[PDB]
């Protein structure tokens, strides 16, 4: 009854961002910091783990609830369908994905993708021992698309889930969306900056 | 007093045991709380459970008044 | 003859979970901790090796014992057939599989996979020197399926395969299954938590 | 005094608020400045903003005199 | 709508440098040093991160703005089209690309690629503590092509991207293009040497 | 001349063990320890390098010496033909193969594969400083096949070829084959245990 | 007294040697014991072998009374 | 145009060594040591970088200078054509290739492949601090071929491209070819041993 | 005095400037010197350039006497 | 005295030089000794070469008495 798969990826090319023109693919960002692995005061960098919520609507992917007997949603590997080319601007090391490369999809076309990631970003950690604490900004954003091609809207800033017994204690978490125009491209470049401040417990 | 319990699978409607006349619903918010949703808990208690900072409690007396957020009272 | 292989993967798509509706794919979990590589009291993490028992029944994979001359079972690479999208929730590093990527299959359809794995999980190891010992919880579970799509039932909790001369001594091992409902999906979410307590010998 | 502002998206032409009679354009040069181009900023100010070492300011009085480098005054 | 993709890579072979007899593929280089990860005075080597601006014109890739309804530019994976075989002559470790493997293309045929890279190069860092500072030369250039096959023209540097709070402070950056003729091949060999001098702050 | 290759891998599937109705594929094992990289008394593990002699007879692979003009043997990549799913049971790290992935083949069907490997195994090295020396057992064996499917026969290893200047000196090497019956499968499970004892020179 | 022995391959039925009138079965539990199952051993002994903490012994007198867990007595 | 590519790899199988009965494929070796990364006196091993010159003549690869308009040479990826199965006999770690996987080819059939490599070999470095200096022998050679199938001839050794500011100073470099017969195969087994002696500067 | 120079691309024949009546060719040997060949240099000089240990100089007076190793004098 | 030598390729029959009247064959056993076979060496010597622990020497006087293990004396 799962002929759906064979059809879903029939005339589908994952290298093409799904837009009906005029209307840009809107992706909903959200970072759920899990734990702060380590901090290098010497080279100014932080090793961190975190779930990363990503969801959009692929107009190509969608099926008639009837033509398919009780097929609510399906788990498809991120390589079979399109996915936002998000990039950790201030990252200094290839992102190590821990969780399976699988994304869910609504019969309507809503694609939900949340991968577990460990990665190191460039950041000032000199004031991590001070009670004031050091702060890091994890700027994310499409790498080859702008507002007219792909809009990046944030939604949930989940502080919950951070390891309780971590040597570091979160004093504050700020997730904010923001745009910026460059000397070209009438359209602006949307980016979500996940700011985090933390001190050393004890 | 008939209630909804998450102790059984699937969530069935068990008759809230003696002494306990209140059906409740406590919801946490873990890691998956951003995608899967807030943790759902349904049970029985004589005295309505106290709310924790991040938690969210809700009690009642009506039968089957504490259903799953995706059902009907 | 072995025409079986060519047939088994004829109309088979490993991206599709073999559910028969009103018959969720039930997978039997089981962890056989081999040895505790190391513990980082600084960043709270444990490096551990372990055999991972996984078995289910793929209704697609199955052959007539007759049509095939003396073909009891066959070794097929995990990439050719479907496999549970299990994920080590509290893990903080991509799982390094040591053993070959092969799985056995019953002529009936019973698939068995045993991958040797080394991986580090987030855990409090501060009380590892105390005679009471520190404890770690290795929570596993489907990352994109629930009770109605894939049921996760545990099995035996074999510890016997633990390294004797290890600098650490196991004081107790607890493998328990458990479900958890969320603000959605009437169906619950199954996961097996392999708990382990250990102290430093001598 | 009508001006061009980058505070709104897309860049629209807002009437430079009271007290402010000068439309301007400040351009930085960040990391992407090598491919995407110099950062573009358009707004209003009574007193023309001061130029910073790496920055590049430009003021005027004409209406819509501070357009995007890819538009027309 | 996006039949373009299927056509663009129809009779295209990425192993072939897109040249038109009498005219060599000219590529525009540009390095935007992001941050100096570390320096090893012991083995003489520097760990550095940087953005790599690369742009050329593939005569094969190009489409009629009309035949295609509002298709300005598209994001294609570097593996689908040809790309300069640039190599870090003085590098001592495989280049770790951090950003997605995508490049933009003009309807005219202008291809642009901006990959984020972390890599270590052989360099004298003995005088990094001195106020005069140590200097490193990052020589880049084709590996199997010369001036007649592929011309390498630079487009000035961009130190405006460096990381402030870095333990090291840039005192000067020199990006210069240069050719070299060998005992063979009448045509020379163009290479761009990105020179950088830096001292230890404080 | 070499149409052989095109024919050899015509109706051949490397995922199928070359059994012939009651003739289990017999593989000849042999380990030639090259050098003992290092020993970790802290976590009990040994880093070792060694050539691994493996040879069997694939009934599928074989050609008429006549039909092929002077074709004695050919070098085929291990991925083109079947190969024993041997696994280092007590290993604690993925095997790093140093030599090329090639294997020779007799016109008769005799396949030979000698891969250079570096790998770490779990082992007690506490008594490595004592004149008595510490000992390690490197147990190898099929991971999904038994005696009826694949028989594992050994042949005395070679102590020679060991680094004469190694910080460690071999006091003895014992390579022995052995079987074992499990609560299942009437057929036993063969395995070759390469035992090695060594002390610290000087 | 005829017994089942694991000393031969496949497991055949050898006549339990003189002095020994008891067939037995000892099962260990190693690393593979989680997938392959408990180690199986079948042999002969005058005096039923003693049980070790983790081991599991079983003796008898009947002929072929100590078969493989996957066979019939 | 460049139809050459499509033709060159038409009836070509890179797994087959290009031999013409009585005319074994002769490959010209040459090592240009770049720099000595590090030395481990503890485990006796040297980390080194070096450009490795390799050139042979593939009788399959060759085109009529006329039939192809001005096509002197082309850059083809080493995976498309055959390449010597050279192996670093005394190496103790998989070779990390730094440069692109490309090789040039003469219209006649002369193939040239010079990849940049970093790798660690087993070697006595105990006398590296002495003015006499320690010496390392990097033995290379076919892995599945002999003199009759593949002849390995060397050429001019290089010490020109060695990093000056290196903590180590080369006192001598000896590149010599040599054959070795075995109890089989009437034909010998060639190999090139690149010997290098170096001391610690200052 | 007409000479061959490597200062221009491709290597053209420039008239060796005043004071300089000698065409020359200096060849180094770098890393690629094993495959690409010895570095080639062609220019002008009043006094023939001195040879360095690894270098290789060659001077002359004839016109176009210092061509590329792959050309004709 | 004519002998077989491994100093030349292929192994040819050289007339064992003056003073030396014994043809020999020494065989080692290296890494490949498990597949390729024991190392083969053929040469000349006045005094038969001494055997080393792992080595294996063999001398003679007859002409071509020290052939390759895959040939005929
Ligand atoms: C090389 O390619 C040419 C085509 O350009 C082939 O055809 C003719 O070859 C002869 C050689 O005797 C030339 O004299 C002709 O000029 C070529 N074309 C014609 C018909 O004018 C040639 O066979 C190919 N191989 C050779 C011999 O070089
Ligand atoms: C099983 O085997 C036969 C072939 O002999 C096959 O056609 C059918 O599915 C089954 N037949 C029976 C009744 O065994
Ligand atoms: C461009 O495409 C149109 C079809 O819409 C065609 O009529 C026209 O001739 C083409 N001209 C170009 C740009 O070559
Ligand atoms: C796209 O525009 C032209 C197309 O002819 C091209 O030269 C340029 O590099 C591309 N980028 C611009 C200017 O947007
Ligand atoms: C082997 O090949 C030769 C020539 O093709 C033929 O005469 C002979 O019958 C063949 N025998 C086999 C092994 O089939
Ligand atoms: C093939 O090689 C095997 C193993 O060395 C040997 O037993 C057999 O006789 C050989 N047969 C031939 C010459 O093909
Ligand atoms: C072309 O091939 C010849 C072989 O005769 C040799 O000079 C070299 O390999 C190549 N030379 C060129 C034209 O670069």
From Swiss-Prot, chains B, D, G, I, J:
Localization per Swiss-Prot or TrEMBL: Secreted
Cytoplasm in keyword set: no
Top-level taxon of origin: Eukaryota
GO cellular component: extracellular region
Tissues expressing this chain: Expressed by the venom gland.
Transmembrane region(s): none
GO molecular-function term, one example from the UniProt record: ion channel regulator activity
Keywords linked to the UniProt accession: Acetylcholine receptor inhibiting toxin, Disulfide bond, Ion channel impairing toxin, Neurotoxin, Postsynaptic neurotoxin, Secreted, Signal, Toxin
Cystine residue pairs: 3-23, 16-44, 29-33, 48-59, 60-65
Binding partners and assembly: Monomer in solution, homodimer in crystal state.
Function: Binds with high affinity to muscular (alpha-1/CHRNA1) and neuronal (alpha-7/CHRNA7) nicotinic acetylcholine receptor (nAChR) and inhibits acetylcholine from binding to the receptor, thereby impairing neuromuscular and neuronal transmission.
Family: Belongs to the three-finger toxin family. Long-chain subfamily. Type II alpha-neurotoxin sub-subfamily.
Protein name as it appears in the record: Alpha-bungarotoxin isoform V31
Organism, scientific name: Bungarus multicinctus (Many-banded krait)
Parent-protein residues present: 22 to 94 of 95
């Amino acid at each position: 009854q799962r002929k759906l798969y064979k059809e879903l990826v029939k005339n589908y090319n994952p290298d093409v961002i799904p837009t009906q023109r005029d209307r840009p693919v809107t992706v909903y960002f959200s970072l759920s910091l899990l734990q702060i692995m380590d901090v290098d005061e010497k080279n100014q960098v932080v090793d961190v783990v975190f779930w990363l919520q990503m969801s959009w609507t692929d107009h190509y992917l969608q099926w008639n609830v009837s033509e398919y007997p009780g097929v609510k949603q399906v788990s498809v590997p991120i390589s079979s369908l399109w996915v936002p080319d998000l990039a950790a601007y201030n990252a200094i090391s290839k992102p190590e994905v821990l969780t399976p490369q699988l994304a869910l999809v609504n019969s309507s076309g809503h694609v939900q993708y949340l991968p577990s990631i460990r990665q190191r970003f460039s950041c000032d950690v000199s004031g991590v021992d001070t009670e004031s604490g050091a702060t890091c900004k994890l700027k994310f954003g499409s790498w080859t698309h702008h507002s007219r091609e792909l809009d990046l809207q944030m939604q949930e800033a989940d502080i919950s889930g951070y390891i309780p017994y971590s040597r570091f204690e979160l004093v504050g978490v700020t997730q904010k969306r923001s745009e910026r125009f460059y000397e070209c491209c009438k359209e602006p470049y949307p980016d979500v900056t996940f700011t985090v401040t933390f001190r050393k417990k004890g | 007093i008939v209630c909804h319990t998450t102790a059984t699978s699937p969530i069935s409607a068990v008759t809230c045991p003696p002494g306990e006349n209140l059906c409740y619903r406590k919801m946490w918010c873990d890691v998956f709380c951003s995608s899967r949703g807030k943790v759902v808990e349904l049970g029985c208690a004589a005295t309505c459970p106290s709310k924790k900072p991040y938690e969210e409690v809700t009690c009642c007396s009506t039968d089957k008044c504490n259903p799953h957020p995706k059902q009907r009272p």
